[PDB]
């Protein structure tokens, strides 16, 4: 627990610590093997995003019971590479960074599972499966999106969702040109035990070559023995997931809907408009599973494997709402991820041999600024849990989409090998940290 | 060493880690008492600020030999309080934050060494002195500024620099009105062994009351046994500092000048103006000591105390140049601080009982964004050590001063009791962390 201990107005009332941590931290240092690993990613969830969410939902002296509860903490770098020069591109996006932590190799913006020479490298999920471990891959984004795709697809551009776009934009990857295929096709080949998110639309496409040509990717998946689920009840009803009967969850056409509604931030929004209170999204159908609900079934099913499992969970629409300059959406999805993180930590503490890691792919735009702020970008004032006004600014783009930022950001871990995120690290160190904790070996 | 291990374009080339860190971290953890403490403060040095400076000066896969070399890392919160309501004010400035880590109590923006009720609370420096330890207070800002002042003065507004402004803005603190006096006057009463910085301008004021009425504050310091120095040569000539002969260095009228020159960022600066390469500041002559030079002498002098010392070092102009939207100024002062930190770490490793801490009072405005970025605020393109462009954006103020931000930010530490910065903590925990490490007590 790291909430403020009492009266924040009085001596010692805002302390998050009750005593000395040296002994407690020594007991958090284990070098034994990790049987399991859970990696939780908030896209765009930099330190600013975390703090804003905490201030709003739990108050400034509050405490995220998931996100803030991991004891070993550091800052890590996530610069991408310029494809032509091989020099740092200081502001990454999902693909290059997901490639980075999943392969241990830097690459260029747009690349999935390939280096700057367009050459494939194996992913941590692929290596876990080879060693006999179960594998899970979960995202509130469409499943073709870069973060979940990176674990199961190798392509020259992240836009190559299905056969149609792959033939056009990844000619070398296309199936009818001898390549491994589209993101969705490769995801089906990768055959993770558990795969849950959105992105049903691309599954409507039919493959133009290969053993299942003329069939929709939906039909292919079924033909190859996958269980299809599309809402929370059916997901819940699933009792097993393995190589004979892998689980595919498709819970929306595109991205899964956000939990909180609020107005878009506006020019002089914190001056011209009144303080905003977030409400639940009334357009989110009740049958859509939450990130934590998806995480529950995943952990339940994957943990059946005696040898162990690897699971990745992505809170995606933190980035998306950050891009859209929508604090309520953005905070809402940070709250959504905290729930999922709680599930993973609850499992991990009971099981005793699980490494849980929580971080983001890169920083983003949202900044917490003073209430009187008069800024050139998009701003909005919110009513927090404290009963006080917080203002948020998005001031790095004139166009309709607010931009990523290149600042280093928090990485936190719990369990075996958690030490390897403390201090300054690079995103690629996370690959090798995970590789080493599971005792995995290159083919 | 946490630099990129090799060729950043190849597998494992961007790794900052050479192996498992568990055994290394176990060694780093000591609960024995700290004999000395060095607290280094980069004013406004958020994780964005650290990253931008590293990217520029050392390249993306580079490594600050001071700043990035502290092994025990975390994230801490620095929200202030609204004076009337006692609820969090989410974006602090230096007075409230410096007051928080120096007293262990939160307070309102503008308050120095007092709580929201205007009650005085003792500072870590005052308590150190009381216990017999030696005390140092070093800054590139004018010494009246909130970060160094917070250790030695208790006033209701940080603007109460000297008698003149105190009578008007802190009438209850004014000396002629029964109070302890202006910041400068209370500083002279506090009588730290070592006090180095700018702010000579205010010492030209005369006191309106008390034992040294009619005399200038400079004359007062002379009469009370202080050694005054005004340049690097004289500073170096000083052989001892103690309560019989305290040292006061005044190296500029106001703030000490910055190392690096570069143009101010502008609207569409990264588009319409060429990439910038920082140069040395021609109007900072070498007779003005650097922060590391001041840190050297301070460490030399204070370390002669058998019982131990407390030293605070502030790189003030990271904040100032961040406000002025000047990447070169801002980055140059971040480099300036890294040197001072190196001096602190070198001493700490040899001595073996010194706790060193590096952090910032709060986050700031500067953001690292993509080169093609088209932002509404002030931007600039810069040529890095990597031979690639990094753009910086300042997008939270339409007036002539870019604003702080509330994001939690990095705290790092080395030595005895350094475990207490790991995980999430509050800026006030830092007070209690330092107090316990030295074993200090209350009256
Ligand atoms: Zn992203
Ligand atoms: Zn994004
Ligand atoms: Zn400051
Ligand atoms: Zn400032």
Numbering used by the authors:
A (entry chain B), B (entry chain A): 9 to 451
From the reporting publication:
We have therefore investigated the functional behaviors of an interaction network hypothesized from available structural data in the Escherichia coli alkaline phosphatase (AP) active site. Nevertheless, these residues are part of an extensive hydrogen-bonded and Mg2+-coordinating network that also involves D101, D153, K328, the Mg2+ ion liganded by E322, and two water molecules. We observed three overlapping functional units, D101/R166/D153, D153/Mg2+/K328, and D101/Mg2+.
The simplest model to account for these effects is that each aspartate residue helps to position the arginine side chain for interaction with the non-bridging phosphoryl oxygen atoms. To further explore the effects of the aspartate residues on the R166 functional unit, we solved the crystal structure of D101A/D153A AP. In one subunit of the AP homodimer, the guanidinium group is flipped away from the active site and adopts a catalytically unproductive conformation that is similar to the conformation observed in one structure of D153G, but more displaced than in the other structure of D153G and D101S AP. In the other monomer, R166 was observed to populate two rotameric positions, one of which is similarly flipped away from the active site while the other is pointed towards the active site. Although this structure lacks a bound Mg2+ ion in the active site, the functional and structural data presented above suggest that this loss will not influence the position of R166. In both active sites of D101A/D153A AP, the bound Pi is not well positioned, populating multiple conformations that are each distinct from its position in WT AP, which likely closely mimics the reactive phosphoryl conformation. These structural comparisons provide evidence that the aspartate residues that flank R166 help to correctly position the reactive phosphoryl group and provide a self-consistent picture of the functional effects of the D101/R166/D153 functional unit. The aspartate residues of the D101/R166/D153 unit make nearly independent contributions to the catalytic function of the central arginine residue; D153 and K328 (and presumably their associated water molecules) act cooperatively with the Mg2+ ion and increase its contribution to catalysis; and the Mg2+ ion and D101 are energetically anti-cooperative and apparently constitute a redundant functional unit.
